[PDB]
Amino acid sequence: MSKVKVGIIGGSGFDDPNLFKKVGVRQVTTPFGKPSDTLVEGFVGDVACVVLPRHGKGHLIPPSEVNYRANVWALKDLGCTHILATNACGSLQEDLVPGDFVVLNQFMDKTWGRENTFYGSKPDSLKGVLHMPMAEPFCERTRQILIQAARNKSINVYDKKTMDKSACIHPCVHAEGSAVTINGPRFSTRCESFIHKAMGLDIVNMTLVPEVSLAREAGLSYASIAIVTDFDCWKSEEEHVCVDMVLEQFRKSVVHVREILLEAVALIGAEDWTKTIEANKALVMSSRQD
Amino acid sequence: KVKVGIIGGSGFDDPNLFKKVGVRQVTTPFGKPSDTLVEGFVGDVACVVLPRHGKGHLIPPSEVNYRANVWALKDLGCTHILATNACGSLQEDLVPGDFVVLNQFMDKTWGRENTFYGSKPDSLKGVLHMPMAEPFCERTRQILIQAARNKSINVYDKKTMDKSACIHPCVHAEGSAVTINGPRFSTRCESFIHKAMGLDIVNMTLVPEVSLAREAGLSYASIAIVTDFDCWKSEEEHVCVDMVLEQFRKSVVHVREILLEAVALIGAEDWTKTIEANKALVMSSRQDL
Amino acid sequence: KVKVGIIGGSGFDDPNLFKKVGVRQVTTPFGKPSDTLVEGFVGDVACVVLPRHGKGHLIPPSEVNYRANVWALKDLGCTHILATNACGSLQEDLVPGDFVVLNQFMDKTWGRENTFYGSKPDSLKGVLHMPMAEPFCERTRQILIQAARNKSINVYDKKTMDKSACIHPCVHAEGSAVTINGPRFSTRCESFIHKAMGLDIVNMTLVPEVSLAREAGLSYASIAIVTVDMVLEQFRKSVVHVREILLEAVALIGAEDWTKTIEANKALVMSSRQDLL
Ligand SMILES: Nc1ncnc2[nH]cnc12
Ligand SMILES: Nc1ncnc2[nH]cnc12
């Protein structure tokens, strides 16, 4: 007890997943404030796991007002070594269809006003200046776990660099992808959606950043599964994103999301992470510029 | 019945549109509006006028209380908001003296309060995710364009008309705006990049005003006033405040004409269904419910 | 005459540019500066030094009080600010050990106090919309470039020289920076997009320092340093070159008359006051 342990952050359409029988419910505080909700601990098989809804169980907290620092820190505090996160998103690409999933490997950040670092010279932060490399922002091993889990659960995986497009059979998990994270709470204009598309981005979401950055700052291995619920608004009027559209597609996909997450947890449990964890901690220390 | 709010930007902080009924100070749950409001009538149509920046222009674009301004107009019972925004052209065919009835934007503002809803005490309870694919009221945009036609001002529609048929000064029937935070103008580097993205104009005051109007269930449309070519051309043509004001002055008369004709045209129609649909859109965007 | 302020970024957290003469710990209407300002002379030219990040580099780019730093310099009587910035390259021709006298930027910062003027209780009353088409002081840029030449450092200008003249290490005579908020570095995706926009370098501290300098009626120019043990040593060498360039630059500034330019800097601030219409 207790390394390794998997934190799971649930977004839209995934506010109150019943992933396992609750063992403990933790009301915690962090040096950066309260988490979105109480943290629920238990087991998937023999693997310690902790579940946390990003927006509160009642989804009363908008993406821009989520205390990403407290959520990640609380997970760290409870002994998590990994975080798996879900993120509802819209597709900016023809090959990414509602019902698909994307194991993101890249992002472009257009958020603001969100506390995005544990470190600084304000009293509300830890002392120091952390300049973390983010060139490939996710934990690669954990990404591959998510993909291998999809395969273990007989869900199609599409890998651009190894398969031709005819092998892109829906619904499928895309083995790579880039996300633009917008601040919200409004969805994009068509003008924004076309610009994002022209930039080469795969999907658009509101919740990926700064969660992914803070996980790394926290010395944790993080990976996102993005649930494609819509085509944003670059296609026809009938295909223009709204809350109803996002929710309806998510409820159709939740079963697969649950399956991937539970299998991913087991697979993380079947491996040693001593060196990777050590390298996570080390990357943090080497990143100190103070 | 219909009641039209008019929000006035740079070069239009004393619109003097009609002859005043009275001046009125209001309070909102989101703070004080930019100034008192002038209430009156255009013909038989109730109209309310609010300068965005205060009558002395002491409030910069990034510090304008757009929530309070928009909520104040809702609270006076406005069904529509017509806005003006001074802007720079990033394109050859949009020249100073022209107007643009915007249909799209790209948002580069930050630090502004851009929603009425949240989980903080200074906001309404709820998580509201408005669709914004086509962010204006289309009926109201078309009324602004018709108003221009009716006041014998040239209308240019790049969808039905060739570039050689562009006669200035003209109202462009569509256009997209990048809204920057201010208060500084753009670098040449920034202007070239916005231009490369395919944006038509640059301004500082469209967003979040347009988004809040939709959140408030109001029909909103903007007329952009081209006062300069930003800074993508030669040095003599690089935007500064004096250039902005000098051109805005020359264009104001046309701006006034369109707005007043627009107010009349809105009042001549029934908006019962549109208003219901406006209200329903808000309700359907509540994810917390 | 003139007085040259120097804002030292990474590598210049605690410089020894001249014999310390005066020490000034000030308080501005916009808060405290990053650290004490150090007074002195380069030859006959009055000079002031201030480390952007503070002596311990405790202060992250996004929490630097740029307003206080610039205002403090203005208050001490500075007419010029020369600034250094450590940066990453986005283009093949810009390599570690190179330098760039910037002439352009694209701003991606947010959350920073970026203007002296506004309606908030602690801003200067007024609305200021400064032109920023060419946001540096051009005479001052050319002084930096000349300073590089006077210290025998290669100068490369892609607009007037063949690629063959790009001999490293070199001062690139023009260049554009994207200024990101930090403190994290860019993802590959972000860098790809910035590069595709045509940006030359990426940094975290240029904006709003350059904007504020202009609002203050000061002449500002920036010398960027393009940046394991061989990288550290290279950066140590870069700092030595920049130190030399700035010293020569202060001398070169003091040798010229700046009456009209200073006047015109001041007139640009007044003509940008929209509230004074
Ligand atoms: N199109 C979209 N943009 C942003 N966040 C989203 N979440 C789901 N769909 C989205
Ligand atoms: N070029 C410009 N940029 C931003 N706001 C403006 N308002 C008028 N011209 C402008």
CA distance B244 to chain A (A): 26
The length of chain A is: 290
What is each CA distance from C24 to A100, C36, C45, C52, C65, in whole angstroms?
A: 62, 6, 18, 15, 17
**Mind telling me how many Å the CA of B106 is from chain A's nearest CA?**
5
Contacting residues for C105 by C-beta, under 8 A, at least 6 apart: B187, B189, B190, C135, C176, C177, C178, C179, C206, C207, C210
Strand, coil or helix: A193: helix
Omega before residue C183 within 30° of 0, cis? yes
Residue A269, H or E segment: helix A243-269
Picking from C105, C211, C275, the nearest residue to B56 by CB comes out as C275
CA distances from B103 to A189, B5, B140, B141, B142 (A): 10, 19, 11, 8, 10
User: Does C115 contact B60 at a Cβ distance shorter than 8 Å?
Assistant: yes
State the Rg of chain B over Cα. 18
Asked whether the CA dihedral B41, B42, B47, B49 is positive or negative, the reply is negative
The pair of structure tokens assigned to A21 is: 């029988």
Give the β-pairing of C37-42 and C22-24.
antiparallel
Q: Answer yes or no: is the C-beta of B228 below 6 A from any ligand 2 atom.
A: yes
Going from the C-alpha of C115 to that of each of A28, A72, B62, C67, C111, the distances in angstroms are 39, 34, 11, 7, 12
DSSP A268: H
Instruction: Count the Cβ atoms, other than its own, within 10 Å of residue A166.
Output: 6
Buried b / exposed e over B240-265, threshold 16 CB at 10 Å, is bbebbeebbeebbebbbbbbbbbbbb
Q: Buried (b) or exposed (e) across B169-194, using 16+ Cβ within 10 A?
A: ebbbbbbbbbbbbbbbbbbbbbbbbb
Tokens 């939740």, residue? A254
B29: which 2 tokens?
Answer: 């749950």
d(CA C80, CA C58): 26
Domain A1-290 matching CATH 3.40.50.720: the answer reads: no
**Phi/psi of residue B40, nearest 5 degrees:** -170, -160
Nearest chain B Cα distance for residue A270, angstroms: 38
Whether the CA torsion B143, B147, B149, B155 is positive or negative: it is negative
Would you say the CB of residue B86 lies under 6 angstroms from ligand 2? Answer: yes
Query: Which uninterrupted H or E stretch holds A275?
Result: helix A274-286
- C1-277: what CATH class? alpha beta
Q: Which residue of C has its CA nearest to A202?
A: C189
Tokens of B234: 């030669």
Do the chains contact at A191 and B128, CB–CB below 8 Å? Answer: no
Sequence ranges of the domains in chain B = 1-289
The answer to whether the bond into B191 is cis (omega within 30° of 0) is no
Taking CA atoms, B61 is separated from B67, B114, B209, in Å, by 13, 13, 11
CA distance A169 to A150: 14
Q: Is the dihedral of CA B106, B112, B115, B117 positive or negative?
A: positive
Mutate to test the pocket of ligand 2, among B94, B244, B250, B252 (most ligand atoms within 8 A of CB): B244
Question: How far apart (Å, rounded) are the C-alpha atoms in residues C33 and A21?
Answer: 55
Our answer to whether residue A15 is catalytic in this structure is no
- Amino acid making up residue A52: L
- Rounded (10°) angle between helices B138-150 and B241-267: 100
Q: How far apart are CA B108 and CA B285, in angstroms?
A: 23
Flag whether A55 is marked binding: yes
AA letter at C255: A
What is the DSSP track for chain B?
A: --EEEEEE-TT-SS---S--SEEE---BTTB--SS-EEEEEETTEEEEEEETTTTTT-S-GGG--HHHHHHHHHHTT-SEEEEEEEEEE-STT--TT-EEE--EEEEE--SS---SEESSTTSEES-B----SS-S-HHHHHHHHHHHHHTT-EEE-TTTS-GGG--SSEEES--EEEEE--SSPPPHHHHHHHHHTT--EEESSSTTHHHHHHHTT-EEEEEEEEEE-TTSS-GGG---HHHHHHHHHHHHHHHHHHHHHHHHHHHTS--HHHHHHHHHHHHHTBTT-
Experimental technique for the deposited model: X-ray
Distance CA C277, CA C272 (A): 10
Residue C7 and residue C212: Cα distance in Å, rounded?
A: 13
DSSP states of B88-100: EE-STT--TT-EE
Distance between CA atoms of A290 and B36, rounded to whole angstroms?
Answer: 51
Closest residue in chain A to residue B195, using alpha carbons only: A195
Beta strands in chain A (DSSP E): 5-10, 24-26, 39-44, 47-53, 82-91, 101-103, 106-110, 119-120, 126-127, 156-158, 172-174, 178-182, 203-205, 221-230
Tokens of A266: 């087991």
User: Which ligand lies nearest the alpha carbon of B245?
Assistant: 2
Q: Regarding the domain delimited by B1-289, which CATH topology (the fold level of the hierarchy) does it fall under?
A: Rossmann fold (3.40.50)
Using only C-alpha atoms, what is the Rg of chain C?
18
- Cα B17 from chain centroid? 16
**Which amino acid is it at C171?**
V
Contacts of C127 (CB under 8 A, 6+ apart): B53, B57, B58, B59, B60, B183, C117, C118, C273, C274, C275
Of C54, C70, C103, C53, the C-alpha closest to C204 is C53
Contact at 8 Å (CB) between C108 and C40? Answer: no
Query: Closest Cα to residue A9, out of A100, A70, A96, A97?
Result: A70
Which residues are bridge partners to C222 per DSSP?
A: C83
Cα separation, B244 vs B236, in Å, equals 13
Ligand 2, atom 7, lies closest to the CA of B87
In sequence order, the 6+-apart residues with CB closer than 8 A to the CB of A3 are A79, A81, A273, A277
Give the pair of three-digit tokens for residue C239. 């700092």
Tokens at A84, concatenated: 């798996």
H or E element at residue A73 = helix A68-77
Beta bridge partners of C99: C171, C225
3-state secondary structure chain C: CCEEEEEECCCCCCCCCCCCCEEECCCECCECCCCCEEEEEECCEEEEEEECCCCCCCCCHHHCCHHHHHHHHHHHCCCEEEEEEEEEECCCCCCCCCEEECCEEEEECCCCCCCCEECCCCCEECCECCCCCCCCCHHHHHHHHHHHHHCCCEEECCCCCCHHHCCCCEEECCCEEEEECCCCCCCHHHHHHHHHCCCCEEECCHHHHHHHHHHCCCEEEEEEEECCHHHHHHHHHHHHHHHHHHHHHHHHHHCCCCHHHHHHHHHHHHHCEHHHC
Q: Are strands C176-180 and C104-108 parallel, antiparallel or unpaired?
A: parallel
Query: What angle (nearest 5°) sits at the alpha carbon of residue A276, between those of residues A160 and A269?
Result: 80
Contact B285 A240 (CB under 8 A): no
Q: CA-CA distance, C51 to C10, in Å (whole number)?
A: 9
Cα separation, C7 vs B284, in Å, equals 53
User: Is A230 part of the annotated catalytic residue set?
Assistant: yes
- Please list, in sequence order, all residues whose beta carbon lies within 8 angstroms of the beta carbon of residue A177, skipping any fewer than 6 positions away: A96, A102, A103, A104, A105, A106, A202, A203, A226
Q: What angle do CA A116, A120, A125 make, to 5 degrees?
A: 75
> Within a 10 A sphere around the Cβ of C53, how many other Cβ atoms?
25
Classify residue C50 as exposed, middle or buried by CB count within 10 Å of its CB (0-12, 13-18, 19+).
buried
Asked if A105 and A134 count as a contact pair (C-beta separation under 8 A), the reply is: no
CA distances from A229 to A95, A246, C86 (A): 13, 5, 42
Write the residue in C63, C184, C187 that is nearest to A106 by C-beta: C187
Cβ-proximal residues to A119 (8 Å cutoff; 6+ apart), any chain: A125, A126, A127, A128, A129, A130, A217, C60, C183
- Name the residue with tokens 């554009």: C176
Mutate to test the pocket of ligand 2, among B202, B222, B223, B249 (most ligand atoms within 8 A of CB): B202
Determine which one of B107, B230, B270, B288 is catalytic.
Answer: B230
Backbone CA torsion sign across A113, A119, A120, A121: positive
Residues paired with residue A179 on neighbouring β-strands, in sequence order: A107, A203
Q: Measuring CA to CA, how many Å separate B64 from each of B7, B104, B113? A: 12, 21, 9
Residue B86 known to bind ligand: yes
Q: Regarding beta strands B80-89 and B201-203, do their DSSP bridges make them parallel or antiparallel, or are they unpaired? A: antiparallel
- R_g over Cα of chain A: 18
Q: Are the C-beta atoms of residues B223 and B259 closer than 8 Å to each other?
A: yes
Cβ density class A254-284: b for 16+ within 10 Å, e for less = bebbbbbbbbbbbbbbeeebeebbeebeeeb
A174 in helix, strand or coil?
Answer: strand
Task: Report DSSP letters for A84-152, one per residue.
Answer: EEEEEEEE-STT--TT-EEE--EEEEE--SS---SEESSTTSEES-B----SS-S-HHHHHHHHHHHHH
What is the phi/psi pair of residue B249, to 5°? -50, -45
Tokens at C181, concatenated: 């908020």
B58 to C130: CB separation less than 8 angstroms, yes or no: no
Burial of B43 (0-12, 13-18, 19+ CB in 10 A): exposed
Residues with Cβ within 8 Å of B27's Cβ and at least 6 positions away in sequence, in order, are: none
Q: How far apart are CA B218 and CA B269, in angstroms?
A: 16
Tell me the C-alpha to C-alpha distance, in Å, between residue C223 and each of B88, C96, C99, C101, C142.
Answer: 31, 14, 7, 5, 11
